[PDB]
């Protein structure tokens, strides 16, 4: 085989050049943009090859850590556009640190808890900042952040009685949920609601009545899921849809065959990463939204007794995704991003890392099989495919809240 | 009146007409986290927004203030909600507000709040007369804007404006036949008008799609649409399609065509086709070709399909 200091890469194989776009001599905006990205990516790939010498890939953990540590405390005015998503920023940063196995000082943990408490609304749920109306996005993020901290102090911050009332206040008769009072409706809400309701043990038999059916209506001719019935299949909305159904134990409401074929088709043959929609560009954040669907589908099919399922790999190219993330999505100054040429941000840092962890770790039943590309130190902590926080954090939180009654219900 | 970037703009803390109300600072706690270092102008507007919100002041000055708050952060849904409360309380001219949201969306077309606000206005007015044209302009700038397409489907379905959408679809497909959002709109229009059960309509669509495939063999959208309109009844229910694809294979053995053949074989085996052993063998051979050479990025998927086929039809 190869010496330990050289590791052959899929993206560097000579035959990999055959995977370049074939535009059939018919140019459109779509093919032109795709070709431009592939050209840049090939240049990047080649920079990691020195003829037969191919040094192991390195995740710049320390650089990422310092960037995250600073962001958790202060942000430049460049983030004014996210002033209504602060609990969300907290989650992105904390989950990134969690994946990197970077401890959270007790003081920082308490400060986060106090801040999220200030974001909690008297009517239930959390807003994008102190005094803001509650919204399912920051609510989902706040709950996840508190669970990552995992202390009784963090858990108890959540006003469970009002949270359940708040979810009821957003529930529509057709099974869908508004993102906030007087707000828009799409599959993101069903996932946010299912996520926080299941973690905090506040699910009632009627809360999600009709929700599974509404989500199934969102799956389209492509096999993927759109934001609302009729819309184009999209990785973000598909993750939300399937994850919510898994929580509701209603995955069978979907055509899992067309969904599986659709998501696997979203991995780019040349880049190795995933696109959000068919015929659109690769993007590091879809490393999670799309790739995260494979562990969910694996579980779904496994529950059905599928005898053909792998006992060692997810149904996507785990190595290629790792190659795309490690070679193309790291900012030398720390942080991760969409693709070469784009600037870093905490959102991409969170999801590029989340996707990398999914690609490195396979687990099913009593079987565990890791594939950590590059130096061993690249190994990230595992992440739960449904909630996207540590599996340990999920178990600890669910066990804690299961000891509490469902607010005003039996 | 005056915009945030206008030379004569004055901070709210310096406006005489606002002197009677005390600004309300944001309480982030003594030891802040994810603390944004706001500009003086940003904080000024929001300190006063918090004041009017806290006092629930349904006034014209409050209404004008939300405009600046929105320019500073159009993603602040709390401001948008309050602005709508004011629109009703003050009985503001909704057509004037439509012109406002039109300009706002043009500036920030990928924002959730602006499109929802527009939908609310259209619902309040029950006036969709400007929608299709406005949306077309947004799509002329970004033909794949998700929010634009979503709003377009809502308007068409809610106000029954189906008459010219297929023509619009054909127009955009001519511009970029690889635009997946347009192929989706195509399915949206047909399934909601004639439906696909009309065999004349289905044949028209299959013919059209095959022609697009011949023009651009590696455009995945057309292949996905072809499978999309035939999958529910079953790919094996269309015997002539298999023959036609097999004839094009030798000259167009793209991974899309090869994968489509496997999809057909899968369905055939699922419907007690004749020559089961032969079909299974052909399907397994293609799965290997896809996994090892033609579609290696999906090696695990194709290996899975190979094993699935054997678990279901070996005998």
């Amino acid at each position: 085989s190869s010496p330990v200091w050289s590791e052959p890469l899929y993206s560097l194989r000579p035959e990999h050049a055959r995977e370049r776009l074939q535009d059939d001599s018919v140019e459109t905006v779509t093919s032109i943009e795709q070709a431009k990205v592939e050209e840049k990516i090939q240049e990047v790939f080649s920079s990691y090859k020195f003829n037969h010498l191919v040094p192991r890939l390195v995740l710049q953990r320390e650089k990422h850590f310092h960037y995250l540590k600073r962001g958790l405390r202060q942000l430049t005015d460049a983030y004014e556009c996210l002033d209504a998503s602060r609990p969300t920023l907290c989650y992105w940063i904390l989950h990134s640190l969690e994946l990197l196995d970077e401890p959270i000082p007790q003081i920082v943990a308490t400060d986060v808890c106090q801040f999220l408490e200030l974001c909690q609304s008297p009517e239930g749920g959390f807003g994008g900042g102190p005094g803001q109306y509650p919204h399912l996005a920051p609510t989902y993020a706040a709950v996840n952040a508190l669970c990552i901290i995992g202390t009784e102090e963090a858990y108890d911050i959540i006003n469970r009685e009002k949270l359940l009332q708040y979810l009821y206040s957003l529930k529509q008769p057709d099974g869908s949920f508004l993102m906030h009072v007087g707000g828009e409706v799409d599959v993101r809400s069903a996932y946010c609601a299912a996520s926080v309701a299941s973690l905090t043990n506040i699910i009632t038999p009627d809360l999600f009545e009709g929700t599974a059916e509404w989500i199934a209506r969102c799956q389209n001719w492509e096999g993927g899921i759109g934001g609302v019935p009729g819309m184009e299949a999209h990785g973000g909305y598909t993750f939300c849809g399937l994850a919510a159904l898994v929580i509701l134990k209603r995955e069978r409401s979907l055509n899992l065959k067309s969904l599986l074929q659709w998501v696997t088709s979203r991995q780019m043959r040349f880049e190795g990463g995933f696109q959000g929609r068919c015929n659109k560009l690769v993007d590091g954040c879809y490393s999670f939204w799309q790739a995260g669907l494979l562990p969910l589908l694996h579980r779904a099919l496994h529950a059905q007794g599928d005898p053909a399922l792998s006992m060692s790999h997810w149904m996507f190219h785990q190595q290629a995704l790792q190659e795309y993330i490690l070679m193309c999505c790291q900012c030398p100054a720390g942080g991760l991003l969409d693709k070469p040429g784009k600037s870093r941000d905490f959102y991409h840092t969170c999801y590029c890392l989340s996707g990398l962890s999914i690609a490195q770790h396979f687990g099913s039943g009593a079987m565990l099989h890791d594939v950590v590309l590059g130096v061993p130190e690249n190994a990230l902590q595992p992440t739960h495919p449904v909630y996207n926080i540590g599996p340990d954090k999920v178990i600890q939180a669910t066990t804690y809240f299961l000891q509490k009654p469902v607010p005003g219900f039996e | 009146f005056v915009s945030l970037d206008s030379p004569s703009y004055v901070l709210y803390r310096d406006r005489a007409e606002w002197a009677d109300i005390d600004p309300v600072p944001q309480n982030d706690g003594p030891n802040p986290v994810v603390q944004i270092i706001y500009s003086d102008k940003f904080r000024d507007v929001y300190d006063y927004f918090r004041a009017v919100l806290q006092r629930d002041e349904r006034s014209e000055r409050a209404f004008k203030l939300t405009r600046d708050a929105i320019e500073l952060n159009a993603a602040n849904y709390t401001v948008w909600h309050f602005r709508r409360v004011l629109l009703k309380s003050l009985q503001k001219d909704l057509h004037e507000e439509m012109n406002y949201i039109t300009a706002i969306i043009e500036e920030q077309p990928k924002n959730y709040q602006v499109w929802h606000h527009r939908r609310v206005l259209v619902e309040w007015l029950r006036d969709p007369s400007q929608e299709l044209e406005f949306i077309a302009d947004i799509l002329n700038q970004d033909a794949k804007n998700y929010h634009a397409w979503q709003h377009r489907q809502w308007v068409i379905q809610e106000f029954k404006l189906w008459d010219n959408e297929l023509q619009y679809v054909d127009q955009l497909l001519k511009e970029d036949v690889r635009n997946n959002s347009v192929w989706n709109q195509r399915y949206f229009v047909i399934s909601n008008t004639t439906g696909y059960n009309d065999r004349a309509v289905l044949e028209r669509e299959v013919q059209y799609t095959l022609e697009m495939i011949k023009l651009v063999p590696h455009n995945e959208s057309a292949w996905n649409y072809l499978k999309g309109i035939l999958q529910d009844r079953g790919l094996s229910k269309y015997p002539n399609l298999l023959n036609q694809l097999l004839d094009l294979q030798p000259s167009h053995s793209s991974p899309y065509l090869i994968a489509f053949l496997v999809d057909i074989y899968e369905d055939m085996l699922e419907n007690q086709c004749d020559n089961k052993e032969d079909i299974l063998n052909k399907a397994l051979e293609l799965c290997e070709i896809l996994a090892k050479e033609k579609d290696t990025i999906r090696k695990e998927y194709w290996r899975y399909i190979g094993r699935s086929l054997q678990s279901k039809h070996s005998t």
Binding site: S85, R188, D283, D338, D345, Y347, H348 | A75, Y112
Partner: peptide, 4 residues
Amino acid sequence: CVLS
């Protein structure tokens, strides 16, 4: 990439 706006989520909300």
